[PDB]
Amino acid sequence: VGSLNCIVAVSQNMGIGKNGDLPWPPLRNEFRYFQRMTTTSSVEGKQNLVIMGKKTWFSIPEKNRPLKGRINLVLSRELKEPPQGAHFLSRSLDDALKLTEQPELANKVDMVWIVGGSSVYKEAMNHPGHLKLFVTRIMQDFESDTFFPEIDLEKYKLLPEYPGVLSDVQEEKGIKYKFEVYEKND
Numbered sequence: 537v538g539s540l541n542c543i544v545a546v547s548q549n550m551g552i553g554k555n556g557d558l559p560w561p562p563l564r565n566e567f568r569y570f571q572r573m574t575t576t577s578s579v580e581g582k583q584n585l586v587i588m589g590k591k592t593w594f595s596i597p598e599k600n601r602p603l604k605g606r607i608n609l610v611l612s613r614e615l616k617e618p619p620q621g622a623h624f625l626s627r628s629l630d631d632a633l634k635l636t637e638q639p640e641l642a643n644k645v646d647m648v649w650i651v652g653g654s655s656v657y658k659e660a661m662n663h664p665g666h667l668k669l670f671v672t673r674i675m676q677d678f679e680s681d682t683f684f685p686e687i688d689l690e691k692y693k694l695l696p697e698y699p700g701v702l703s704d705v706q707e708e709k710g711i712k713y714k715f716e717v718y719e720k721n722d
C-alpha cells in the first residue's frame with residue numbers, strides 16, 4: 537500500500553457541501569481533475585483506493601458509483617454491509633488502513649485517496665505522519681453546511697510546481713479557482 541492523500545474542492549469560506557450537494561455549480565474540468573488524480577496509478581496490476589464517508593457515498597451522483605477504475609471503500613459505524621456496490625466497508629480510517637494489510641487487499645491497492653466528507657477529512661488530518669492534500673481553492677464564497685478543516689501551515693507546505701497540476705488560475709462558468717498541493721510530515 538502506497539501514499540495517503542486527501543483531495544477536496546473547497547470555497548473561500550471553507551465550504552464543501554450543502555444538503556447533500558456541492559455548494560457551487562458543476563465545474564466539469566475540476567471534476568475531470570478529481571477523476572484523473574484519484575484514478576491514476578503507475579503501479580501496474582493495482583488500483584487506487586478511494587475512501588469516503590456514508591453521506592458522501594450516497595451524495596455522489598449515482599450513475600458515477602462505484603467510482604470506475606478505483607477500489608471503493610465506505611466508512612460507517614451504522615452500515616453492516618458495503619452499500620450499493622461499494623467493494624468494502626470499515627468503521628474508521630484506521631480500520632480501513634488495517635484492511636489494506638489483510639490478504640484480500642494486500643496486493644491490490646496503490647495510492648489511497650480520502651474523498652470526503654468533513655469527519656473523514658478530520659480523521660485523516662488527525663492521522664499521524666505523511667499526508668498530501670490536493671486542494672482546489674474556489675475563489676469565492678458559496679453557502680455551505682459542511683466544511684473542510686483548517687490547513688495548519690506550521691505542518692503543511694505548499695508544493696508550488698507539481699507535475700500534472702496546472703499552476704495558473706483557472707476559470708469555468710465565470711468562477712475562478714486554483715489547484716494546490718500541500719504536504720505534511722508530522
Ligand SMILES: Nc1nc(N)c2nc(CN3c4ccccc4C=Cc4cc(OCCCC(=O)O)ccc43)cnc2n1
Binds near residue numbers: 544564570595600652
Ligand atoms: N478536487 C475535488 N475533490 C473532491 N473530493 C471532489 N468531490 C466532488 C464530489 N462530487 C459530488 C458530490 C455530491 C454531489 C455532486 C457531486 C458532483 C460530482 C462528483 C463527481 C465525481 O466523480 C464523477 C465524475 C463526473 C464526470 O465524469 O464528469 C465524484 C464526486 C462528485 C466533486 N469534486 C471534487 N473535486
